[PDB]
Amino acid sequence: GLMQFTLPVRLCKEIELFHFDIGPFENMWPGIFVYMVHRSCGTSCFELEKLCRFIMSVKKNYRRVPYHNWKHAVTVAHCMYAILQNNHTLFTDLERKGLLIACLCHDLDHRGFSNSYLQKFDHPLAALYSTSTMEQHHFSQTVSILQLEGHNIFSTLSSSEYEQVLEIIRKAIIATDLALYFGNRKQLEEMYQTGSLNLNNQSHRDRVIGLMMTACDLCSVTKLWPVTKLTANDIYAEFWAEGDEMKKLGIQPIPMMDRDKKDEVPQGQLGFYNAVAIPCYTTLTQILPPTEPLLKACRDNLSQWEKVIRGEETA
Numbered sequence: 001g002l003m004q005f006t007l008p009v010r011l012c013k014e015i016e017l018f019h020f021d022i023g024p025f026e027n028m029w030p031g032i033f034v035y036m037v038h039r040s041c042g043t044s045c046f047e048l049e050k051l052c053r054f055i056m057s058v059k060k061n062y063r064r065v066p067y068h069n070w071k072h073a074v075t076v077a078h079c080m081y082a083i084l085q086n087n088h089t090l091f092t093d094l095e096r097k098g099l100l101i102a103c104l105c106h107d108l109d110h111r112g113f114s115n116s117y118l119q120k121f122d123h124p125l126a127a128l129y130s131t132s133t134m135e136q137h138h139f140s141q142t143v144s145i146l147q148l149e150g151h152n153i154f155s156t157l158s159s160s161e162y163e164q165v166l167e168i169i170r171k172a173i174i175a176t177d178l179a180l181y182f183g184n185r186k187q188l189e190e191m192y193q194t195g196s197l198n199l200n201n202q203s204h205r206d207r208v209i210g211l212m213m214t215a216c217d218l219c220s221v222t223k224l225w226p227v228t229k230l231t232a233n234d235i236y237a238e239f240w241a242e243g244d245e246m247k248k249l250g251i252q253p254i255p256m257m258d259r260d261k262k263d264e265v266p267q268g269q270l271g272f273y274n275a276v277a278i279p280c281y282t283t284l285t286q287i288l289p290p291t292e293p294l295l296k297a298c299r300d301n302l303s304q305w306e307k308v309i310r311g312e313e314t315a
């Protein structure tokens, strides 16, 4: 308890903002994550030694890929931290414990390829997990790490509590499969607009946490423009590599993965904000009003992409 994590003055202030960027110093991200855990969960939620050992084994099992990397893991966790701090009365002890950990682990051992490439490639993981292929792999990787000697960060929970928290994490990680988002958000929009949404309903909680996980996972669209623009370059570096690999299989890639369609990125972004991002943050804002700043920043970046299309901005 008496060893408390502290951040420099700028970080201490700005980490509370939804649009906080965790910065380029890799060696500071473990400290940043522990701080967010101590403040959102509590200093006694975890033994510091085990948490640190766990954090470092998770980092080791993320790969050196352009976007789906350790920095994305901490970025997604930070967005969850801001949502939990601005809605602190709405979540349980086990949910605070589970959710920052789920966010850190959500893309474990990502190779930079979609579930669809793994299917067309006939990768072994597509045989093992027929849907949410990579997401079932991320969870499996989370369990492996939790089961390493000195890594049971949930060692003080009862058997039944340990099982609840692993189930929170499992559901949260699976919800990051964007193919499941479309259904989940439609269900939540209906439930909100008929007044049937009920946070005491566990199946409704599950859906809200899923939407929170989508929001956190896409949160690059909720940063200041310079962050948003530079992060878009990182995901296309992955998408275009996948499109190359599709071409090697004799398959025409979809437009977002073809590097020859590079000049159409601003319009692809516009399409993505209109069909996915805006609806996502819009629905989340209705259920959790304090998440408003994510929707605001998502709208600001939509205007930036329109300015790029009109040739008033470059990218």
Ligand SMILES: CCCn1ncc(Cl)c1C(=O)Nc1ccc2[nH]c(-c3ccccc3)nc2c1
Pocket (backbone or CB within 6 Å): 217, 218, 220, 221, 231, 232, 235, 255, 256, 257, 261, 262, 264, 265, 267, 268, 269, 271, 272
């Ligand atoms: C990091 C940046 C935003 N982002 N966060 C998560 C995820 Cl997925 C995305 C994201 O960018 N998704 C996305 C979805 C559909 C798209 N269609 C096109 C496109 C491109 C060229 C020609 C025609 C179409 N680009 C796309 C990008």
Ligand SMILES: [Mg+2]
Pocket (backbone or CB within 6 Å): 106, 107, 134, 176, 177
């Ligand atoms: Mg993922």
Ligand SMILES: [Zn+2]
Pocket (backbone or CB within 6 Å): 072, 076, 106, 107, 176, 217
């Ligand atoms: Zn992700």
